[PDB]
């Protein structure tokens, strides 16, 4: 019944004042993109930065298994858009937040399906 909870470990490490994971790979892009959360190519808008997906995945970066039963990665091989105000901690951001399955924007950072 034992499984390491890396997600909770990182969350608690951040709460206690630990420095966010660094060296996430920020891409050059137009910043005139769709603003969707996770895309096949950088899609940052004016208020976002785009990063290589693998480098923003806690499981990829920590060399641990992915929480999927198939062990598949949401981010590897794609690009993740992070709000510029949150780009000091892309791993934290992707961990804590969730993508709307309807419009593809980050819930609470672009999703407007609630009106």
């Amino acid at each position: 019944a034992f499984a390491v909870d890396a997600a909770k470990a990182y969350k608690d490490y951040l709460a206690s004042g630990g420095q966010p994971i660094t060296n996430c790979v920020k891409m050059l892009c137009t910043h005139t993109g769709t603003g969707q959360a996770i895309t096949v190519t950088p899609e940052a808008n004016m208020d976002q930065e785009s990063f290589g997906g693998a480098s923003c995945c806690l499981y990829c970066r920590c060399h641990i298994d992915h929480p999927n039963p198939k062990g598949f990665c949401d981010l590897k091989g794609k690009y993740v858009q992070i709000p510029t105000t949150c780009a000091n901690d892309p791993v934290g951001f992707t961990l804590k937040n969730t993508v709307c399955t309807v419009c593809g924007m980050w819930k609470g950072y672009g999703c407007s399906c609630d009106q």
Partner: protein
């Protein structure tokens, strides 16, 4: 002076035609650094400018393109260059990367270990190498042609590069190989390209454009490296990150280049002409299978 708005500077043809002796490389702006956009790593900027320059050449871009990237890991454990290559390449392009040490990557497949342990059944449309051993920067010993991974790379090109395919292989003043320069003469065109963000370094990318599988011109590799250093020694390049701010035309255009399976006998002058223009790739179109050799041993008692 327009060079500052280019992604970099390519070695001018007249310098390729010289017969210089090898000198020490002495760069006017050694130690200077370009001012990168906020939060952008040198290796992202470097690969971006390399891809921007490759956009100006006649690269073959087939459907289901195959690209392999050697020396893809950083000391940070991630793969900045691979991420730029994947941004650049059409969506769906098969990307494989490799390095001696472990790293996390956006490539479709990553092989860890010495490049000599990497084997592939199939042929490739584009080979990128950033392999480099900083130990070579030993200024107190003579600067001879190097073997090591350059030997692998020359064999890999002759055995596993599709006709019509292209390469970009990182070199420096001390990290270079004469046969690799000789092999540049087996492409329709070649150059040594210096990125504007790294112009204070003797680094360049040796680019072979559209592989022909046979010598089109005879190149003495010892003389050509001396020609390259002579060019670098007499043409200061102003550090610049200007081209990083305009990415609207960055994506490699999907030309749908034709792929054909052909045998030695059928490569006539019409085919060779098509290869030379970036209009044809010759290789099997089977599925891509790779592997790395693992040395087995038992160190008990």
């Amino acid at each position: 002076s327009s060079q500052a708005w280019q992604p970099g500077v390519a070695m001018p043809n007249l310098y390729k035609m010289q017969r210089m002796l090898l000198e020490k490389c002495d760069l006017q702006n050694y130690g200077d650094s370009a001012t990168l956009p906020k939060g952008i790593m040198m290796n992202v900027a470097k690969y971006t400018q390399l891809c921007q320059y490759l956009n100006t050449l006649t690269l073959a871009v087939p459907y289901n393109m195959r690209v392999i990237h050697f020396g893809a890991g950083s000391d940070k454990g991630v793969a900045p260059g691979t991420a730029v290559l994947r941004q650049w390449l059409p969506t769906g392009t098969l990307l494989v990367d490799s390095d001696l040490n472990d790293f996390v990557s956006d490539a479709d497949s990553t092989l860890i270990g010495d490049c000599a342990t990497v084997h592939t059944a199939n042929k490739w449309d584009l080979i990128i190498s950033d392999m480099y051993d900083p130990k070579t920067k030993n200024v107190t010993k003579e600067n001879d042609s190097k073997e090591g991974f350059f030997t692998y790379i020359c064999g890999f090109i002759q055995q596993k590069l599709a006709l019509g395919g292209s390469v970009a292989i990182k070199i420096t003043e001390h990290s270079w190989n004469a046969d690799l320069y000789k092999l540049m003469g087996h492409f329709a065109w070649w150059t040594a390209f210096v990125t504007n963000v790294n112009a204070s370094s003797s680094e360049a990318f040796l680019i072979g454009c559209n592989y022909l599988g046979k010598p089109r011109e005879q190149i003495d590799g010892y003389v050509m490296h001396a020609n390259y250093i002579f060019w670098r020694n007499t043409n200061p390049i102003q550090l610049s990150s200007y081209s990083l701010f305009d990415m609207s035309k960055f994506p490699l255009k999907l030309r749908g280049t034709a792929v054909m399976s052909l045998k030695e006998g059928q490569i006539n002058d019409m085919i060779l002409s098509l290869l030379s223009k970036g209009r044809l790739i010759i290789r099997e179109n089977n599925r891509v299978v790779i592997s790395s050799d693992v040395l087995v041993n038992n160190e008990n008692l």
